[PDB]
Structures are given as C-alpha cells and as structure tokens.
Write a protein that binds this ligand. Structure first.
Ligand SMILES: Nc1ncnc2c1ncn2[C@@H]1O[C@H](COP(=O)(O)OP(=O)(O)O)[C@@H](O)[C@H]1O
Ligand SMILES: Nc1ncnc2c1ncn2[C@@H]1O[C@H](COP(=O)(O)OP(=O)(O)O)[C@@H](O)[C@H]1O
Ligand SMILES: [Mg+2]
Ligand SMILES: [Mg+2]
Lengths: 7, 50, 51, 370, 370, 7
C-alpha cells in the first residue's frame, strides 16, 4: 500500500 | 400509443412542474394560517388604540 | 412579583403584542411565496393545451 | 463546590460547578504495552490513562472501556476515575459531591454499578445521575425543545417540552462518529491507504475532524467530484507521508442520512428526528419544530445544519417552520449545562446521601435519579 | 366452492367454505433484498412474501403493506393475494367466488379499491365483503353482542345486534400487538438486550407469544418479581444465545390496560368496552354485557380473561352480571365465521356478480353489500 | 450488549 504496509 | 403517433405529448412532466410542488402544499392549512394573522393584527389595532 | 404580579393588568396584552410582531417578522415573506406558487400552478394547468 | 464529570464513549471531561470551561480535557482510553520491557531506567508503568497513552500510543494496545455508552470493562473504568480525581483534577473525592451523565435507554446494570463504585471506592459525600442529552438543552438556555446528541457510541433523539423529558418518544440510534471512523477506513482502502490497528485509528480519527464535511446535495457533489480537482486536499501523516482524498470527504458524513451504506436497516439521522416528533402531542409539535438543537462532537461538520434543515423541510409539511440551533460551543454543552444545574440551589435536595445509599443499596438510583 | 380470504395486518388466512381451519396461514409481509446479488444463475426473485420471506428475513427489508388498518401500498397488497391464490392455495380464482373482510369504520376510499382490483386482475365470479368483527361472534354461535376485537394493526369494539353493525357506537383504540412488540423492545433493553431492526422485530414477537402473560394484580406481582427469581424464564435466540426476563412477562401486556405506560391519553380496553356500551340503548344494554367476546391474536395472553372480568366488574354496576366469552379457537374466529357465512344457502342472494358490476360500476358495493 | 451488538 501507499500509506500503511509495504504494498 | 403516445410515443408512436403523438410526439407533441411525449413528456408533459417538465412543462407542468409547479403542479408537483403544489401537491406537497396543503391548501386549507395555508388559508387557516394566514387568516389568523389578519385576526390577530386586527385585534392588535383595537388593543393598542382602545 | 415585580413583573408578573405587578404588571398582570396589561402583561398579557403586551405579550400578545410582542408574539404577533415576531410572527409577522418571520412567516410573512414565506407566506407570500407560498401563495404566489399555488396561484401560478392553477394558472399553468388552466393554460396548458398539452394537458 | 461540586464536581462535574461527563463520561463519554471516547472523550471524557471534568471540571467544577459554575465554571464556563471544563478543567480536564483528555480522551478516555487505557492501553497496555504488548511488547516486553527491556530497560529498567524509568518506571514503565503497567498501564497508562488519558493523554499519557496517546503520547506513546504506538506501543500500546488502546482499548475503549465504554462502548455505545455502556461501560464494558469496569476494571479499566476506575483507572480513569482514579486518574481524573488525583492526577488531573488533583482533588479528594470525599469532600465534594460529584455528578455523572449517561445516555438514555441504557441497561439497568450500567448505572447501578457506578453508584456502587462512587459510594464504596471514592466515598463521595453525594452523587447524581443525569441524562446526557437533557443537560445539553440547559446549555442553550431553553426548556422546550428537541436535542440532537451525537457522540461516539450513541446518537439519541429526545424531545424535551418541560423541565423533564418525554421517555416514550426517546429514539436511540447506535450510529455515531466511531462507526464513521470504521467507515472511512474501509472506503479509504480504495485509494491505497491501509489502516487496521487501533493506533492508526486515532490517526483516522484526526482526518475526519479536519477534512470531512457535509455536502448539501450528495448526487450533485459526486457528479462534481467526477471531474477531478477542486476538492482533493493534502494531509500529512505523522510518519511524514502526504495523502490526498477525493470524494470521500463528503461520502463518510453523508452516511448519517443514508445508513444503507453501513448495512443497518435503521433510517437516517434526519428521518429519526421526524419519527420522534410524531410520537408527541400535536400542540407540542409546533414548539419542537422551531427548537431543534444539535449537540455532540459528531455535529461539528461544516454545513451539517444546512443540509439537515433542507432534509427535514422536505419531510415536514410546509406550514410549520423549522429552525436548527447550532451554538458554536456545542462540543461541551453537556458539561456546561451540568455546571449550571450543579450551581442551582434547588439541586441541593436532589443529591443522594451516603446514608440513603446504605439503606437501599445500589438500587436507589433507579427510583431517585432519572 | 367459495374462497374465504382473511387479509390481516399480521397474519393472512385463507381456506374454503365449510372447513374448520384455514388452509394457508402465513405472515402478511413483503420483502425486498437490501444487498446486491453476487451468485448468478439462481433465479433469485425480486420480492419475497409470506413464510418464504420469513425464512430468509435476515437479508430482507420486511414491510407491512397494511399499517393501522389503512392500506398504505396498493401495489404490494395484490402480490400477497397473488401469492395467496396460485401458490398457497393452488386454485384458479376464475371458477370460485372469493370472500374478503373489511374493518370497522373503514374509509370509503378502500372499499371499491379492493373491488376494482379483484374483478379485473383476478376476475372472480362473485364477491362479498363483511365486517371482521361481525364474523367474530358468528363463529361464537351468537348474533347479538359486543366484540373485543384486537389484532396487529388496530383494535375495535363493536356492539353487534342481529348481525347489524352500529356505526356510532364503534370505538377505535390504537393499542395493538405491534405497539406492544414495540413496547416490549424499549423495555427489554433494561436487561442489556438491544433489538432494533425489523428482522429481529419478529424475534420479540416470538418471545412474547410464548413467555408474556397477564398478571391479575400488577402491584402484587412487581413486589414478588423483585423478591424472587421464580417468575424468570429462559428463552433461546436462533443464534444460540440464552436470555432471561424477570418482570417483563407481565409488564408488556399490562400496557393494554395502562396505556399511560406507552403515554397514550386514551385509556385501556377495559373502560373502552364500558365506554362503548354506554353509547347503546338502555333496554338492549342487558344483553350486551353477558355476551361479550374476545377475538384476535392479541387476546391470547394467559390470565387475560379473568383480569378484564375483574376490572370491568368494578366499572359495571353491582346489579349487572358480566360473562366474558373467550373461546380457545378465537384466534381463527374471524376466518371460521366467514366460512360459516359463505356456506349458507341463503348467502347466494347478496352475491355481487361480474355482469351486474359492469353496468353498476365500482359504486355498487356501497349499496349492494354495504 | 449481551443479546445484540458487541456491547
Ligand atoms: N472538528 C471536528 N470535526 C468532526 N468531528 C469531531 C470534531 N471534533 C470532535 N469530533 C468528534 O466528536 C467525538 C467526541 O465528541 P464528544 O461528544 O464531545 O465526546 P464523546 O463522544 O466522547 O462524548 C470524537 O469521536 C470526534 O470524532
Ligand atoms: N399466543 C400468542 N400470544 C400473544 N400474541 C399472539 C399470540 N398469537 C398471536 N399473537 C399476535 O396476534 C397477531 C395476529 O394478528 P391478527 O389477528 O392476524 O390480525 P388481523 O385480525 O388483522 O388478521 C400477531 O401479530 C401476534 O403478535
Ligand atoms: Mg458525548
Ligand atoms: Mg383483527
């Protein structure tokens, strides 16, 4: 993800 | 039938839109509400003057 | 005692005067719009050849 | 003096009678550190309460002891109360009566336990239990009106015509800001931002308080948002990353009036107002229309009153006039009204005595308080 | 064979003339799914009614087409009737006369409205409409009396006499089963159980039908209920949860006798029964007292008969005798009485034919069957 | 709650 996690 | 041989009557909703708004309005209460104002103000005139 | 008992002779009439003035200051303008709306609709339907 | 404490689902305040502003302002959360202590230099307390937790909220398991206005965890609840009286308010409870506020339509077990705690843990000289929403109307200087309270766990509508409210027309809805926080995040995942833990939930809480707003026309605004730009705003995360949000600015606050997006069959907040006023008498209906009052931190959204006034206007017949009152400081109306009520001399006889509690146990709260 | 169809606010009853029990007894509900369907190829219907709607009620938004007696939706009302004939009864209406019932003091607007939708959509060969209250005592085997008609939508008190209704003496009271079910939930939350949605509104309907009962003395029973746990009973939720109610068994049904508990200025049925009989003639008043009858599913509560007998006795003069007739089959009394009326040989006289309607038009019903 | 919701 863009904000939060890596994805 | 209308949308086949009567193009002039295709959609009468847009031409008559004030009737829809007036349907939500209760006529009898409107006269009752406003006519009370004439009653009250006339009672004020005698109350203030006499 | 200084307000209700003291002025009970004309208190209600003074209150009767104030309530109407505030009522007129508020409902009068929208009542005119409501009347102008209903009369216009009646004229519109009477003057509609499509209907 | 008499102390005023207003326990809320997420936000709890406390102060003194006659004051115009609550003394203590800190959220009501207790967290426990999941990780293991490595360093022994500092205290590293077992638990932290209030503003202490949010400062270190990254490493705590934040828990809300009260849910939907119901204290689920009583063990944690006394930790707040102990913290309020000794750390924030730094006063001894056994000298002053204290008043607590509750939502209407609560379980009888909720408000019997607090009275037991007050007269056994803190040994307060006196106590009182008063509905949250009714005190809000006192802050507006009115006694004939309907109060729209909307906090974090409860969204209750109550009409109040006289010094006491009508219990029969009280409509309580469990749709509030905390449900809204759960709602933007699932929608926010559409834009590529993932927030799952409770630590980032407060970060989620912040963006709602600053960027969310009520749209007057949801259908027209979403069409406007389809053209892109002119609505997206940039917000900086505590990490440092900057996020941009489009249509979601109005979509989440819009869910108040269309709960179909959240999956519960109850009608919108605009509609339940109409239902409650239908349950009262015809003559009292005229007064309540012109005396509609909003309260609670949820009602802070810009333009919420304007859209609310439009919605009720369509449902209500055009004869009666609708005026929505939105005082600027309606955030703390519940506490402020309590300060006025506590300051009243007539209220010295509606206090509950410690001796009276002893004779009747904790069951006296049903009969005396309301 | 003449069909006898009993449209009701809660339950819909249908069968055949001469039968001792309705053939189909299914709820009068209409359901429309609130969620989109993702599993294709099933042929899922658009609208669901009756038992099938009740079976899958969790994912449906149930609506009552009839509320407070008046039909608020004429489009759904035919659908349940359409399901009534072809699905539940599996009989073609083209070759059978059908019997429907009408409510006391019904507005004239509806009466041709059912007429104009049956002779056209289903083209039934013959028709007749009578009062459900009149058919109540017909099943009881008497022709003169007063009926304590209570149901899901409305309640009426009709002092019938030789089977001819008295319009001026008809009293309408808004204390129906739906009100009690709505009152049961607002008082059930005191024990920590929160039922709000419409799907679970049936759940409390199931609970009160099995557990609620009428207490002879309210003041004595609350004292005993508080003192001992004997009155408490355990009920099983469909999810497996176990609930217990202590005093709500006798409290919800008591509102039928104390409407101020709901906040209605109109008083209970016990005085309304006495109020109605005050309007009749003095000479006939002797007969009406001794042939009082109870009807409808609302009057199913245990111990309801002796409680009303005790209360009206104090209201009634000491000279008069009161005989409360409560047949155990009075649940289907309205349906059974119609089957009795249809089976009569002389009942062919006041048929309204399809041909005669054509020249007479919708207005014939007001004068033919009155 | 006990019967209903999470509370
Ligand atoms: N500026 C704001 N805009 C939108 N929502 C806000 C704002 N400030 C506070 N809130 C909401 O109000 C809620 C708390 O309001 P309040 O009723 O004062 O406390 P509680 O709900 O705990 O009683 C918070 O959960 C927050 O989401
Ligand atoms: N054993 C029972 N105890 C309590 N209430 C009951 C019982 N059986 C049925 N009822 C109630 O009676 C209602 C049935 O109403 P009904 O008589 O069918 O209305 P109508 O007379 O309009 O057809 C249901 O809503 C149900 O709540
Ligand atoms: Mg609050
Ligand atoms: Mg009935």
């Amino acid at each position: 993800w863009x904000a939060x996690c890596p994805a | 039938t209308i949308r086949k041989h009567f193009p002039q009557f295709d959609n009468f909703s847009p031409e008559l839109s004030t009737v829809t708004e007036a349907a939500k309005l209760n006529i009898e209460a409107i006269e009752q509400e406003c006519s009370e104002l004439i009653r009250g103000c006339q009672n004020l005139q005698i109350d203030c003057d006499s | 005692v200084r307000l209700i008992v003291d002025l009970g002779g004309y208190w209600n009439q003074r209150m009767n005067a104030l309530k109407v003035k505030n009522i007129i200051e508020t409902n009068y303008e929208n009542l005119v719009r409501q009347t102008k709306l209903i009369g216009r609709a009646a004229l519109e339907l009477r003057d509609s050849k499509v209907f | 003096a008499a102390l005023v404490v207003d326990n809320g689902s997420g936000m709890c305040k406390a102060g003194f009678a006659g004051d115009d502003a609550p003394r203590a302002v800190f959220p009501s959360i207790v967290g426990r550190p999941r990780h293991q202590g490595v360093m022994v230099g500092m205290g590293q307390k077992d638990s932290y309460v209030g503003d202490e937790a949010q400062s270190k909220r990254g490493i705590l398991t934040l828990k809300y002891p009260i849910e939907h206005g119901i204290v689920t965890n009583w063990d944690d609840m006394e930790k707040i109360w102990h913290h309020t009286f000794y750390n924030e308010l730094r006063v001894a409870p056994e000298e002053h009566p204290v008043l607590l506020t509750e939502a209407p339509l609560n379980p009888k077990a909720n408000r019997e336990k607090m009275t037991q705690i007050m007269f056994e843990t803190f040994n307060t000289p006196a106590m009182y239990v008063a509905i949250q929403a009714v005190l809000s109307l006192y802050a507006s200087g009115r006694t004939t009106g309907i109060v729209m309270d909307s906090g974090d766990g409860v969204t209750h509508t109550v009409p109040i015509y006289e010094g006491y409210a009508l219990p029969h027309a009280i409509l309580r809805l469990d749709l509030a800001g905390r449900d809204l926080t759960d709602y933007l995040m699932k929608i926010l995942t559409e834009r590529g931002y993932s927030f799952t833990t409770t630590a980032e939930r407060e970060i989620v809480r912040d963006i709602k308080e600053k960027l969310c707003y009520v749209a007057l026309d949801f259908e027209q605004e979403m069409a406007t948002a389809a053209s892109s730009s002119s609505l997206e705003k940039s917000y900086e995360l505590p990490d440092g990353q900057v996020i941009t949000i489009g249509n979601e600015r109005f979509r989440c606050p819009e869910a108040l009036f269309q709960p179909s997006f959240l999956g519960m069959e109850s009608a919108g907040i605009h509609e339940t107002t109409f239902n409650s006023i239908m349950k009262c008498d015809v003559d009292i209906r005229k007064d309540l229309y012109a005396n509609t009052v909003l309260s609670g931190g949820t009602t802070m959204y810009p333009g919420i009153a304007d859209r609310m006034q439009k919605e009720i206007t369509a449902l209500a017949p055009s004869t009666m006039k609708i005026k929505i009152i939105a005082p600027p400081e309606r955030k703390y109306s519940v506490w402020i009204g309590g300060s006025i009520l506590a300051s009243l001399s007539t209220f010295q006889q509606m206090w509950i005595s410690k001796q009276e509690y002893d004779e009747s146990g904790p069951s006296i709260v049903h009969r005396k308080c309301f």
